[PDB]
Amino acid sequence: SIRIFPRIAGRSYIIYGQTSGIICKRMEKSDNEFVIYNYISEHYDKFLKKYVPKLYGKNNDMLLLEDLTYNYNNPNVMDVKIGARKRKSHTSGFFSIRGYTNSHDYKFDPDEYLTSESTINHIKNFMEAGGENRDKTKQVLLKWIMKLSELANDLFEINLKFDGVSLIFIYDDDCSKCDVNVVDFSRVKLIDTNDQMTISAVTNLIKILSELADNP
Numbered sequence: 001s002i003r004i005f006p007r008i009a010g011r012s013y014i015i016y017g018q019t020s021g022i023i024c025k026r027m028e029k030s031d032n033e034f035v036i037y038n039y040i041s042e043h044y045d046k047f048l049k050k051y052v053p054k055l056y057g058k059n060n061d062m063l064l065l066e067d068l069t070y071n072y073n074n075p076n077v078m079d080v081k082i083g084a085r086k087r088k089s090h091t092s093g094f095f096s097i098r099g100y101t102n103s104h105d106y107k108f109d110p111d112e113y114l115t116s117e118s119t120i121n122h123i124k125n126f127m128e129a130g131g132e133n134r135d136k137t138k139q140v141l142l143k144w145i146m147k148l149s150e151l152a153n154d155l156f157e158i159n160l161k162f163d164g165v166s167l168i169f170i171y172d173d174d175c176s177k178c179d180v181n182v183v184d185f186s187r188v189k190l191i192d193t194n195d196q197m198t199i200s201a202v203t204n205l206i207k208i209l210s211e212l213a214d215n216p
């Protein structure tokens, strides 16, 4: 009938598609997420190809989207808001961890403002549930760093304010493959410059992840 999707964060009605590899996200407030997908498609298709989950189509108010967790045996997922919050400063300065797999088990609260110490430990907690193998964690961090690097670089040439967008970090329990993608275009806007706020979010995450990958 209807299988509801294991969101890691956010408020939206998201369900498994009737078919493999798809989730349906309801647009609650407006069709702005759909208008923005189609804008990015026409003006920046390379950005869409590399970083954004595929939009397969629309069914009334629902978006048929690529399930990012589909190709994984045991996904571990972390949602980090890197674009500006509606009102409210970021819980970790330049970004906000909205949640992660097993966050309850480390008494993570999305409203708690965090020192640089807490922030790092919460990312380390995210890495624990697979991790263990010291240098499968390095390979996961380094592959995330590789992609966020290209993303931070590519953002300089993109005239959008990425208000409210998130990074979805995934890795498998048996620390093989991993990925990070940009999601949630519902409050994204056109502007005549780049988004220095969102760039600082990504560069800061790159800094934090590099520190963990170098850590002995």
Ligand SMILES: Nc1ncnc2c1ncn2[C@@H]1O[C@H](COP(=O)(O)OP(=O)(O)NP(=O)(O)O)[C@@H](O)[C@H]1O
Pocket: 006, 007, 008, 009, 010, 011, 012, 013, 014, 023, 025, 053, 065, 066, 067, 068, 069, 077, 079, 164, 166, 168, 183, 184, 186
């Ligand atoms: N393409 C995707 N593949 C897999 N999981 C996804 C995908 N898109 C969204 N999610 C999951 O859904 C959660 C929230 O959906 P998101 O697209 O961020 O918007 P939202 O629900 O409108 N949030 P908000 O209005 O700020 O409360 C994420 O934290 C992920 O766990």
